[PDB]
Amino acid sequence: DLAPALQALSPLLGSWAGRGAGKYPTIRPFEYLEEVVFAHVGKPFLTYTQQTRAVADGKPLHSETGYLRVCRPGCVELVLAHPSGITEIEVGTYSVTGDVIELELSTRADGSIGLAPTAKEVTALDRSYRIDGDELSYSLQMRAVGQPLQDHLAAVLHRQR
Numbered sequence: 817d818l819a820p821a822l823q824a825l826s827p828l829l830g831s832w833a834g835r836g837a838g839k840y841p842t843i844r845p846f847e848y849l850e851e852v853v854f855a856h857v858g859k860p861f862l863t864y865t866q867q868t869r870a871v872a873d874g875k876p877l878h879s880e881t882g883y884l885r886v887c888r889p890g891c892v893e894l895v896l897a898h899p900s901g902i903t904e905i906e907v908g909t910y911s912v913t914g915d916v917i918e919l920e921l922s923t924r925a926d927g928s929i930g931l932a933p934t935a936k937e938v939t940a941l942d943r944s945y946r947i948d949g950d951e952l953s954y955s956l957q958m959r960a961v962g963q964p965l966q967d968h969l970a971a972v973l974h975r976q977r
């Protein structure tokens with residue numbers, strides 16, 4: 817069933833829901849609700865989909881979809897499409913410390929950003945993920961629209977039954 821390469825990341829599999837917040841120098845701060853699904857099809861990658869919506873009115877905000885590849889155990893390539901007209905490849909590493917997994921990725925570690933002609937200018941994205949039992953937390957830093965690399969997002973999600 818599960819590819820041997822994915823064994824360390826098996827706790828990621830399933831549905832996650834929670835809430836986060838974000839900011840950037842060029843915008844007003846915001847909050848969001850988030851739903852994530854990790855799945856697989858028997859190969860050395862997870863499938864991944866995210867949908868976010870406004871806490872106030874449940875209006876859809878951001879989504880993202882793609883794949884978490886294991887480039888040999890310990891190595892990850894996160895490959896994503898964004899509905900804002902942007903593609904992202906983040907590269908990095910993970911550690912297992914008992915029930916804690918830590919993933920550290922960046923477009924800056926031989927990753928990629930692609931921009932559609934009508935997209936906003938994003939030039940780097942960094943992601944830090946922590947899975948501690950039934951809790952998934954992350955921060956995302958962004959270099960974009962004239963601003964240095966800095967926080968855009970962070971959230972805390974919980975495993976769904």
Ligand code: HEM
Nearest residue numbers: 838840842843846848868877878898902936938960961969
């Ligand atoms: C949970 C995921 C995310 C949420 C809820 C979110 C939410 C928002 C919101 C509400 C804004 C301000 C309103 C707007 O410009 O549409 C914004 C701006 C922005 N976001 Fe995000 N975002 C998320 C992820 C991302 C990702 C992954 C990227 C890059 C791929 C990104 C890039 C930007 C940029 C470039 C801006 C515009 C800044 C400007 O116009 O100066 N966001 N985000």
Ligand SMILES: [C-]#N
Nearest residue numbers: 877878879900
């Ligand atoms: C982010 N839109």
